[PDB]
């Protein structure tokens with residue numbers, strides 16, 4: 001709405017802030033992609049100075065001796081306010097500090113919640129009553145996990161959206177590769193191109209694959225609280241299912257395409273376990289390196305974890321365009337290849353023919369694109385509240401059943417394609 | 433029309449007969465793919481016996497000691513009649529010999545003209561008056577070159593079709609790889625699928641590529657009489673252009689799809705040299721093997737040959753479906769890869785996006801499929817007389833101009849992608 005922007009990093013002392021957030025805003029400022037008049041303000045309980053943040057974060061900056069002038073300018077635009085996350089006086093100090101900056105009373109404010117969502121309820125409250133700009137826009141960036149089921153997500157989201165409009169809520173998701181956004185871009189373009197062809201008349205089966213050849217790598221502890229369905233399927237694979245199956249949007253506005261994605265989701269009924277194959281990866285005896293260790297051989301994984309690191313799930317969009325057309329979401333860690341593709345198999349009328357939309361994967365690198373998008377106000381690659389609600393609805397009964405009965409996942413060897421029962425499922429619903 | 437078939441190999445003493453024809457009919461008979469009651473009769477001037485043909489041709493049979501019983505049966509069904517190609521008495525001897533075979537008076541007769549087309553006029557005449565079956569069908573297989581320009585091809589074809597109906601004429605073309613027919617099959621299937629999408633509205637440019645990484649390999653002598661346009665472009669690339677651009681056929685009959693191919697061809701006007709880039713390959717100094725030798729370093733190439741071994745040509749289908757959409761035919765010998773693909777570039781509305789139809793290339797192996805097709809009467813992968821006429825019309829003025837002015841082709845290094853002027857042409861008509 002003007003030229004002056006303030007970038008508040010709530011929880012600036014943390015791991016995401018030090019390893020990713022500060023480096024990428026460095027890279028955007030260095031390449032001249034931030035607005036010219038930008039200030040960066042960190043906020044957390046620990047009593048730090050900008051010197052401390054620089055000391056602990058510049059190792060990740062890829063700072064070269066050529067750049068040490070723009071780097072000094074960048075840190076000149078940096079400040080840090082210490083305070084508690086539910087202390088009114090602390091937010092008063094933060095707000096008045098922002099107001100003291102050059103043109104701060106009327107600058108746009110971008111709050112990025114580098115904080116465990118367990119504190120979100122407090123932060124979003126205090127921001128709402130203490131730190132929002134009266135003239136500039138106010139955009140919050142929330143971070144995963146967007147709850148862990150329909151009920152928890154519903155509670156958190158209903159809280160956040162009772163304080164901010166949907167065009168102020170940016171739910172960012174950026175942990176699956178530097179090309180994460182190009183995926184969705186080319187899928188949208190393919191939907192626009194092949195729209196007339198993507199019917200139940202030509203397509204017999206659609207599959208959506210996310211394979212990674214590496215394991216949890218000494219961090220199975222974190223992953224174990226969530227599982228492969230919450231990690232990849234409920235968020236990303238389901239988004240690209242939407243992009244494939246959606247109708248033509250009314251325009252190219254973010255909210256028209258998001259309307260169409262939500263319409264697609266509202267046609268998918270809840271998945272039962274008979275259409276689900278879960279798997280856990282064991283160590284490769286003959287391989288070397290991390291391939292020798294399995295999932296339970298990760299020290300951070302609790303003994304007896306039935307958490308699935310691989311899942312194959314069958315969903316159905318139930319409308320006139322798609323009916324009985326199976327959408328097979330297959331994903332897993334510690335597999336044979338690093339592939340993220342979408343294959344559509346065609347009704348033979350003559351070996352079955354399929355159209356493959358693959359995203360070659362080894363300027364902005366998806367995360368940088370999302371920050372720039374919140375700066376520009378483009379909400380397209382951010383999940384909407386109703387979209388998120390529908391995703392959780394689709395997957396919550398299954399997740400509850402898994403947590404309740406704890407079915408032992410099928411073992412598969414590190415570097416394999418996964419359980420053969422997943423191939424069994426695909427064949428059972430009709431594939432080849 | 434019955435169970436008894438006679439396979440007459442006119443010119444059985446030749447190179448195609450010994451190295452390819454006899455081996456593949458061996459392979460079809462061995463795998464039980466020929467009709468149970470089949471006889472093989474060779475015919476040529478040289479006074480041979482079946483023992484001679486076996487001696488000189490079984491090296492190419494891949495004959496294994498397990499198979500030496502079906503092999504003796506196969507050669508038991510073999511006979512050889514010697515005679516002249518314009519001697520009435522010789523064809524009388526051939527015809528009466530066929531009549532003497534078991535059920536020969538009423539067997540289907542399949543004449544395969546393993547002969548330089550310079551004699552075709554005689555052979556097709558005498559067959560027509562001496563050796564056609566009165567009860568069974570009579571199918572002739574003619575061989576390249578189907579003339580060298582519109583006039584010569586027109587003369588030869590008008591002669592052959594004044595003696596045989598079009599459903600008796602099988603113009604076979606089978607020298608570009610064991611997967612030559614799968615190419616056209618998947619292209620037809622793609623036309624059927626993406627029909628509604630393939631418009632001037634979505635497509636900005638279509639390219640059709642035939643690259644080979646090997647040179648002429650000590651046989652530039654033969655190739656030099658024809659050139660890369662007659663060798664690859666006027667026949668194969670143009671056929672697959674037709675398969676891409678055609679309307680939906682009235683049915684799946686061979687003649688309906690061939691009607692649509694001819695309709696496409698009748699919309700392409702003659703190509704002038706300003707849309708043509710010709711190239712000749714020179715030896716790679718730093719490479720090794722045959723890559724050190726160029727085209728003129730082939731001993732069988734006459735000194736000073738301006739024959740092009742690479743060509744990039746732009747054609748336009750002129751109808752409502754395609755208008756100003758450039759079809760770029762690019763092909764050459766001694767290049768960087770062995771690739772045969774069709775790329776369709778799309779109108780961006782956002783780097784340009786293209787749909788790639790590639791044919792993976794390293795049961796029947798295309799040649800075997802064509803022989804089986806003539807046995808079954810499927811004319812689909814054989815060029816029709818009007819289709820051939822249109823191809824020659826499109827390319828004859830350019831070929832005449834090349835033969836008349838002898839433009840020196842652009843040199844390109846063995847293993848290169850070819851002349852940069854071809855990239856210039858593609859860019860000039862709009863590509864990236």
Ligand SMILES: NC(=O)c1ccc[n+]([C@@H]2O[C@H](COP(=O)([O-])OP(=O)(O)OC[C@H]3O[C@@H](n4cnc5c(N)ncnc54)[C@H](OP(=O)(O)O)[C@@H]3O)[C@@H](O)[C@H]2O)c1
Pocket residue numbers: 011012013014015016017044045046085113114115116117118119143144145175
């Ligand atoms: N794949 C994923 O889903 C994924 C990956 C990475 C990050 N994330 C999300 O990104 C966010 C960043 O977390 P992080 O891993 O970077 O670091 P973090 O250590 O979780 O949190 C950073 C800051 O949060 C404050 N904090 C942490 N736990 C707290 C608590 N129980 N009560 C109050 N304050 C607390 C501390 O600030 P002070 O002590 O200085 O006050 C700490 O420096 C989280 O929301 C996390 O879920 C998600």
Ligand SMILES: NC(=O)c1ccc[n+]([C@@H]2O[C@H](COP(=O)([O-])OP(=O)(O)OC[C@H]3O[C@@H](n4cnc5c(N)ncnc54)[C@H](OP(=O)(O)O)[C@@H]3O)[C@@H](O)[C@H]2O)c1
Pocket residue numbers: 443444445446447448449476477478517545546547548549550551575576577607
């Ligand atoms: N890429 C291509 O375009 C390509 C590749 C291979 C073959 N072909 C075609 O396939 C056919 C087979 O030819 P080929 O290479 O296998 O062998 P060929 O040596 O050309 O001819 C085979 C037989 O033809 C007879 N013959 C040859 N020249 C003759 C002449 N001037 N007058 C009369 N009879 C003659 C001889 O029979 P006798 O002496 O025993 O009577 C000879 O054994 C030709 O039509 C050729 O164009 C095309």
